[PDB]
Amino acid sequence: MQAIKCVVVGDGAVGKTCLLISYTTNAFPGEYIPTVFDNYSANVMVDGKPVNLGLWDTAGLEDYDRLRPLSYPQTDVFLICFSLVSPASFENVRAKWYPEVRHHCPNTPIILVGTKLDLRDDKDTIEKLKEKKLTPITYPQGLAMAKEIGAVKYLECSALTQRGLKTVFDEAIRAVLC
Amino acid sequence: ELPEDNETAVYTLMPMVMADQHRSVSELLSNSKFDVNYAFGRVKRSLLHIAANCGSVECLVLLLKKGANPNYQDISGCTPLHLAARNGQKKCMSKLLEYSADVNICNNEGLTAIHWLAVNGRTELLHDLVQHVSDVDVEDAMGQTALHVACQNGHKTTVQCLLDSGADINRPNVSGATPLYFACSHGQRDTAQILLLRGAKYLPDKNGVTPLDLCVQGGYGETCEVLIQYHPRLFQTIIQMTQNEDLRENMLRQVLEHLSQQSESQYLKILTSLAEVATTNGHKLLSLSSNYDAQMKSLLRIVRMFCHVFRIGPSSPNKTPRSQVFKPLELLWHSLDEWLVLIATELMKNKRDSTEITSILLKQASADCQDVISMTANRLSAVIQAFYMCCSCQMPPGMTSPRFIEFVCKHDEVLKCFVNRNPKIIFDHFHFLLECPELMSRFMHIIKAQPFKDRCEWFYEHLHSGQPDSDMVHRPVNENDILLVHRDSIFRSSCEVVSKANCAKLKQGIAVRFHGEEGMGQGVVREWFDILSNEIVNPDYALFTQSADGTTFQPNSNSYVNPDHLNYFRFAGQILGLALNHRQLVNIYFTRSFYKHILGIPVNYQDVASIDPEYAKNLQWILDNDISDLGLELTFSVETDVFGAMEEVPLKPGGGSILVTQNNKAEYVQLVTELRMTRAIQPQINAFLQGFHMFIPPSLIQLFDEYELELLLSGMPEIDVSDWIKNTEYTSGYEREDPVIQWFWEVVEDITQEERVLLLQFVTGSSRVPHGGFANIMGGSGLQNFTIAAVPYTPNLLPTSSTCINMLKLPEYPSKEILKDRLLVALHCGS
Ligand SMILES: Nc1nc2c(ncn2[C@@H]2O[C@H](COP(=O)(O)OP(=O)(O)OP(=O)(O)O)[C@@H](O)[C@H]2O)c(=O)[nH]1
């Protein structure tokens, strides 16, 4: 039996908590609660021998900006995450996350994932964004961002309606294995 | 010490609790009046929640002894039990229970300690917890029990403990879900197998979705074999599901593959079932009343799996039974033959009807009936297409079944009649002509008569099928396959690796990376073609000579000096054909003669002027006038270059003794053509054609003439920005810096056409422009519409663009004068 460590990193209010609770329990929280620490698990198969998947999550506060590095050691995969409806978080990837993750762990593969796809599909969301004179983030340049930050792959997923959720972890496990 | 204010107190306490200073907190807790139960922040989470979440066991006991309530729930309804349960801190659990912490409390959604514990699968904690938990089958808001999620995450040990505790095995959800149903949803093997041993029941959901509906959709072959082990009846249901159009074809292939390698018996079963259902669909397809789109799609859908699965051989862990399954198909083929006879009788009816039409012509309701037959022909075109695919897989590739060739020719009139009635049939179903050159000749003239547009896309879909595509995958190729050479001496460096490196490895990759650099970009690679292309036509190499018109290039007659010109010309053919394979443009303008050589079309008299216009004028004049009475005294012998020596050589064996006259002047000019432009550089052409056809088969490219090939190979010669914007004169554009856009429109028209191309060259990387205008711009990810991104303006700022993505970073210039000056400066530096 073999085990791997996977970590989720991204700005607060992005949907990291929703991604792992929805995947593991199909349940979507109704309220708005930041976190300080979380953990999950799953299973996969390799050559007839089970392989365990370990998933860690981290917060965004300044105090946890230093503890989050402390959770990186012996990490085998990273999942940098950003909010598809919040351009500021996407811009923060270049400013904060891409330098930060590479500074602590540059060797391991990096995967870019976009959440809040449900708000991205909602028509009312673009209406309020339009009044605010804002436009949602798009796919083709997001892949360019993945190249710029050296991320192996770029994916888009939902947590409420689960559109494309399952592919996120399949590419992650596929990417790390090969 | 902590301040009297609680907000400052918790902000001070919050950092230490992680550090777990057991002594330090003690004095602060004892000598301060702050309330531990106080909720802080919008979330209103108590300090106990933070302590419980982390592993600082000491702070828990101090907080609890101070009156902290372990049963307290925040707005989310999660108590200290939940946060500690997720992290599986056994010390926290023991101390929580010691001081009156109850485990039966639930959150807003009904999730309890068992659910979080089940998700993480900490069986050791489950052993003790269940003894305390009142009920183990507590349902959530959606009516899902603990076992539902535990099985979904595939925790083999978790389910074993729960079943030993009496957990329900057949609890239906609100929708009717079964713990097997959720296990198959995420494709778990061990949990599904365990459930079958205990005797899990198979029932469908209240919504009507059977468990196998997701299993086939998920394409988890591992779960299928265990399910079919105990329920062989459901094996047929998989075949039935093929009819439904809501299921993706790709998934069904992989699942059927996995079952195939198991044993030859199931391999035969899959083939037989596919043939049987295919036979039923075929008869339904022929019926006029049946839906036409659905039936042909279903039949083609099923046939594709049968063709692919047939080609997948078995493994030890090739005889008759592969042909026996064709016996159910020969029933389908027999009906097809009979229908091909029946339509042949229809031709007699049409021919008999033609007698009435021709008789009226000589002496000089049916439309609807013909349409139905044409619609029937369209449906008949689908089945024959399936028959071709079955024949194609009947033996190794590259060969057409002799049985296929004999009857298709036997019904040549039927096919040629249908195409005339419905020219779209070639572009809808009758596609397989491109494989057999012999069948191509019969329909090539018919196909060429059709509009070029319909020919273009049909070419694209076939060629792109065999591409080693990686664009959307964007997975880097193996470094062993990616070339790594220095850009200096591009012509020499590129060829050296190609010839030295293994041929198989090179043809399996697309990446072009320079040695010692990580640079990788479509625009950069597109620029690599430009530099490489220019060197090919560079007079220094002497490989190609400038044409008389000065706008086209063809191989130089003196190129033979280089000893390895055969090899290098062969390499050049590979590079040029590689661009056509992926559809990138090459800036070189080849001569009319050269493009004909690519297609193999013989040159004519006009091509003579490419080298000697004066001599061509003599060849056109001789044809235009009778020479029998003019006494030219010219035989089939003309001076020609022979290994750099001017000598008199007959054009054909014994031609010197054959006088040229009116009867034989037509060929005399024709023979002279290859004498000058083809034989002279025939060795060079032979090598070039060898390289070019490696990636572009002659039959596929033969479909297009010289003019069409250049447009595809080199691109559109005439361009205009109005195509991008699809307008001529608006007061505003995209409502983005419109006054700047107007100036941007004013500058582009003022600047000459040639320098506007250079602007596109910088962003795109190729001097030429793709066919179809701006509607078919290829960027980093293929089709990508050109766009411009606004940037804040700074003094002496020039526009910039990431060449991989065909997009421009245009600063918000406040005046037109600055706008035009800055781009002009960029042109100077960007050259
Ligand atoms: N409808 C919808 N809402 C989402 C989605 N992703 C995130 N949200 C909302 O965004 C809020 C903030 O995300 P959280 O659940 O707190 O996860 P997080 O942003 O990573 O917060 P931390 O894990 O503490 O860093 C959630 O409460 C959700 O309501 C989504 O994909 N669809």
Numbering used by the authors:
A (entry chain C): 1 to 178
B (entry chain B): 22 to 338, 349 to 395, 437 to 903
Paper lines:
Here, we report a cryogenic electron microscopy (cryo-EM) structure of the full-length human HECT HACE1, along with solution-based conformational analyses by small-angle X-ray scattering and hydrogen–deuterium exchange mass spectrometry. Structure-based functional analyses in vitro and in cells reveal that the activity of HACE1 is stringently regulated by dimerization-induced autoinhibition. By contrast, HECTs form a thioester-linked intermediate with Ub before transferring it to a substrate. A RHO-family GTPase, RAC1 cycles between inactive, GDP-bound and active, GTP-bound forms, allowing for spatiotemporal regulation of its interactions and functions.
However, the HECT domain is drastically rearranged relative to the ANKs, with changes also affecting the interjacent MID. The crosslinked HECT domain now adopts an L-conformation, in which the active site is juxtaposed to Lys147 of RAC1. The structure shows RAC1 cradled by the concave face of the ligase platform, contacting the majority of the ANKs. Intriguingly, the HACE1 binding site of RAC1 comprises the critical switch-I and switch-II regions and the interjacent β2-strand that are known to undergo nucleotide-dependent rearrangements. The ligase thus conformationally discriminates between the nucleotide-loading states of RAC1 and selects the GTP-bound form as a substrate. Zone I involves ANK 5 of HACE1, with Gln173 and Asn174 forming polar interactions with Asn26 and Thr24 of RAC1. Disrupting contacts in zone III (Arg107 and Asn108 in ANK 3 of HACE1 and Asp38 at the base of the β2-strand of RAC1) generally interferes with RAC1 ubiquitination.
